[PDB]
Ligand binder design. Structure first.
Ligand SMILES: CC(=O)CC(=O)CC(=O)CC(=O)CC(=O)CC=O
Lengths: 408, 347, 71
């Protein structure tokens, strides 16, 4: 009765590239998508001078909704799905986000208060402003466009929301509620409120650098915070039987999913990484796959002091002495951190890696950290035969999320 | 598949600061818009000053609701295995009350304007993390921000997690704080005039803030410890309607929850005018005959809390406390065109 | 001064009478990095002087915060 879940379509809007073809070429060669920005330091007085931008006066550009519609269009065209193939009742959406249209909410708040100086003017509140506060704008808009009548959800579990959307999408297909499922995440956090929030927290990279692209350096001894980014990842998940009947192209099998809590801290991550290790273990039991077949890991790799040590020790706990051989990488070295969107974009990259039997490198690898002493594929990538792949994600409220992907 | 049962419920509302106070008021009322605040409420006794300083009021409402629900369930929380307990939350608007002044001050002063708790206070997933630190619950925990039906999905997928055997206990529910100047002025103006393209025009109604939570747990686990079982969660429905044609077809999936039961009470969304016409026609097709009870005029629009607080009341009604009903089915739907429903059965 | 002691008392949730100014914040009062950043923000608010991450990292005790604001 339980059914296998497979990825038939990919759509991505990332700083490394917009579209599957452009996105892959750049991450293959190890080209940074990180851009230097001026309005952070000059206007607001942030120590950060690097962002992951895809393309000072406040603008409600509706990027969160835009990136979701663009990625969904690319993913549905890549999957080769059309009204004839799609059964509305058995087709559902699951697009996750950490802050949704916070840019639109921030811009609305400052407009109605005239630059945040005065109290709120009721008359200046427009009819269009209410759409900004809608968290599931991306989920419902995509569901409307392609006629999805099955469960439409918006998981907002911070930076683990991306994999959690893929997780609930996998459950819908496996337990026989849906045949097709549009899953992923969209994020647009390059606004002063979002950047200032992390800046104030001290989670962003703040060290003085000649090259701002090097500011994101996962598993390096120099790392001091994550470079914030924007973008969207969309995966067309569907049943193995449903894909074979219509003769669809299969990227990879989404085998298992698991999620736990740290019960430690909201932002800080512990060194031992026991919680993340338990999440990897439960994901493998869920997929019914032995840890011995795992020969590649797409790590979260934010390039903070606490995250990279947490994941390294977590992989060391599960695999043990066999952990050293396994290639482990972070896409956030090129793309930066798109919060919930980063899980989906890395999940799109992971599907392309298994398909093309290639592993993208962790760029900007300077001085090797004595604590982080695993294979991180520094600077130059290579061809590698991936059997069973792991995908680690972490966010606020001590949330760990793992999905197990597999070659068909 | 595993059978899921409700063992404890907790909610706070302008009508009451506990489940018994709310239930007694709505029954009494059963026999331009404003935001209704809580009366005679303070979170000094429940939450310590260190933690309360750094969290928004929506997280405060969530923790007091969970504490009341766990106390009613009579769970030995210390002896419970933390790896087999999860937290499912529904929250749409986040926590603006804690960060509003800091977002405005950022554009005048600079970084000095906003402090370091803006990153954890505002986001909707703050409540699940805050609960997980206090109680130490470590199992699968998710937050939904799907407009209107966030909390309705939270209960349904918390039951599915127990069904598939992910956790034995689940703290599922929702919370909202609408009294912050930004969302207060927004709801008082725009929400009244806005119609649903799928469903139609809205009924005249106010808004109310607060929280509602249920202690869902596996049936054998509940019987093991000798728990006072309120009711059994028998069915969950989660669909979407892009247009008016599919809308009427989707309501027939809500009719399947009844199992052709005549001794059933149907709690309705109560937001939109056309609901009673289209839902009754769907029941007429499936030969379903039930009683219609609307709680929305009395309880108001609470977004994610709406539908969850209904399930809190429905659990209390079925726990040997209308005449004699053995199944209560609650329906909710969004502006964009969701269709969500939960089924609760007696004993 | 009294303006410093009242902040550290409120932020850590300690009785202002029982609070020690010479005691370690990280060890004794289990203070995290976010609370230290939040403390530094309110030093910028009250006194009106520039405070960076390099400067407030050395604030080991309640006497260290007093020695900085004097300079
Ligand atoms: C836009 C603001 O004001 C800042 C927030 O509250 C949003 C937020 O904080 C989302 C979030 O939790 C991100 C993580 O979990 C870690 C991911 O990188």
């Amino acid at each position: 009765q339980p059914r296998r879940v497979v990825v038939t379509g990919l759509g991505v809007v990332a700083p490394t590239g917009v579209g599957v073809n452009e996105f892959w070429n750049n991450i293959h060669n190890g080209k940074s998508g990180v851009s230097k920005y001026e309005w952070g330091r000059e206007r607001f007085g942030f120590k950060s001078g690097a962002i992951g931008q895809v393309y000072f006066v406040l603008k409600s550009e509706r990027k969160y909704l835009q990136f979701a519609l663009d990625a969904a269009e690319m993913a549905m065209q890549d999957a080769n799905l059309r009204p004839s193939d799609i059964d509305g009742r058995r087709f559902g959406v699951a697009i996750a986000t950490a802050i949704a249209d916070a840019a639109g909410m921030e811009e609305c708040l400052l407009r109605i208060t005239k630059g945040g100086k005065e109290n709120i003017h009721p008359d200046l509140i427009k009819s269009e402003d209410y759409d900004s506060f809608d968290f599931s704008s991306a989920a419902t808009s995509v569901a409307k466009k392609y006629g999805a009548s099955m469960s439409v959800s918006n998981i907002s579990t911070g930076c683990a929301a991306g994999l959690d959307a893929l997780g609930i999408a996998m459950e819908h297909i496996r337990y026989g509620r849906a045949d097709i499922m549009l899953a992923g995440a969209s994020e647009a956090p390059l606004c002063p409120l979002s950047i200032g929030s992390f800046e104030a927290l001290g989670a962003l990279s703040s060290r003085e650098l000649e090259n701002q692209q090097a500011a994101t350096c996962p598993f390096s001894l120099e790392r001091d915070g994550f470079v914030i980014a924007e973008g969207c990842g969309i995966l067309i998940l569907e049943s193995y039987e449903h894909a074979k009947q219509r003769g669809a192209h299969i990227y990879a099998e989404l085998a298992g999913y698991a999620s736990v809590n740290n019960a430690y801290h909201m932002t800080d991550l512990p060194a031992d990484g026991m919680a993340m290790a338990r999440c990897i273990d439960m994901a493998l039991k869920d997929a019914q796959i032995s840890p011995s077949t795992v020969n590649y890991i797409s790590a979260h790799g934010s390039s903070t002091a606490q995250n990279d040590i947490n994941e390294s020790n977590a992989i060391k706990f599960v695999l043990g002495e066999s952990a050293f051989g396994i290639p482990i990488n972070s896409l956030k070295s090129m793309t930066g951190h798109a919060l919930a969107a980063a899980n989906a974009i890395e999940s799109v990259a992971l599907c392309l890696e298994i398909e093309k039997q290639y592993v993208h490198p962790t760029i900007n690898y300077q001085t090797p950290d004595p604590d982080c002493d695993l294979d991180y594929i520094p600077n130059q990538g290579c061809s590698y035969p991936i059997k069973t792949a792991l995908k680690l994600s972490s966010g606020f409220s001590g949330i760990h999320s793992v999905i197990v992907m597999r070659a068909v | 598949r595993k059978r899921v049962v409700v063992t404890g419920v907790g909610a706070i509302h302008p009508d009451g600061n506990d489940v018994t106070a709310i239930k007694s008021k709505v029954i009494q009322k059963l026999l331009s818009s404003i935001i209704r605040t809580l009366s005679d409420f303070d979170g000094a006794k429940y939450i310590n000053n260190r933690l309360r300083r750094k969290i928004d009021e929506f997280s405060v409402y969530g923790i007091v609701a969970v504490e009341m629900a766990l106390k009613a369930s009579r769970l030995d929380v210390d002896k419970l295995d933390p790896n087999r307990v999860g937290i499912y939350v529904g929250n749409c608007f986040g926590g603006w009350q804690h960060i509003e002044d800091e977002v405005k001050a950022l554009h005048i002063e600079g970084i000095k304007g906003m402090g370091p708790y803006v990153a954890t206070a505002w986001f909707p997933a703050a409540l699940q993390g805050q609960l997980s630190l206090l109680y130490g619950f470590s199992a699968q925990s998710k937050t939904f921000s799907t407009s209107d039906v966030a909390g309705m999905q939270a209960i349904g997928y918390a039951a599915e997690a127990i069904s598939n055997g992910v956790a034995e206990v689940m703290l599922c529910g929702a919370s909202e704080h609408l009294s912050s100047p930004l969302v207060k002025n927004l709801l008082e103006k725009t929400s009244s005039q806005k119609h649903s393209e799928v469903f139609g025009e809205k009924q005249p109604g106010d808004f109310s803030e607060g929280a509602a939570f249920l202690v869902l747990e596996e049936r054998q686990h509940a019987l093991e410890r000798g728990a006072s079982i309120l009711c059994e969660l028998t069915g969950f429905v989660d669909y979407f309607a892009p247009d008016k044609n599919t809308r009427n077809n989707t309501l027939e999936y809500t009719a399947e929850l009844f199992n052709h039961n005549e001794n059933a009470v149907f709690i309705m969304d109560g937001i939109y005018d056309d609901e009673k016409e289209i839902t009754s026609k769907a029941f007429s097709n499936k030969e379903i005959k039930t009683s219609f009870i609307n709680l929305r005029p009395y309880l108001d629009n609470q977004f994610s809390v709406s539908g969850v607080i209904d399930s809190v009341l429905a659990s209390s009604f079925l726990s040997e406390s209308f005449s004699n009903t053995n199944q209560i089915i609650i329906q909710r739907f969004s502006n964009q065109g969701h269709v969500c429903a939960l089924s609760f059965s007696a004993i | 001064e009294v303006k410093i002691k009242t902040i550290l008392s409120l932020f850590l949730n300690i009785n202002i009478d029982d609070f020690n100014m010479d005691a370690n914040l990280a060890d004794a009062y289990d203070m995290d990095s976010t609370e230290l950043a939040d403390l530094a923000k309110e030093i910028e608010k009250e006194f009106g002087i520039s405070v960076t991450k390099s400067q407030f990292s050395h604030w080991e005790t309640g006497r260290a915060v007093l020695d900085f604001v004097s300079s």
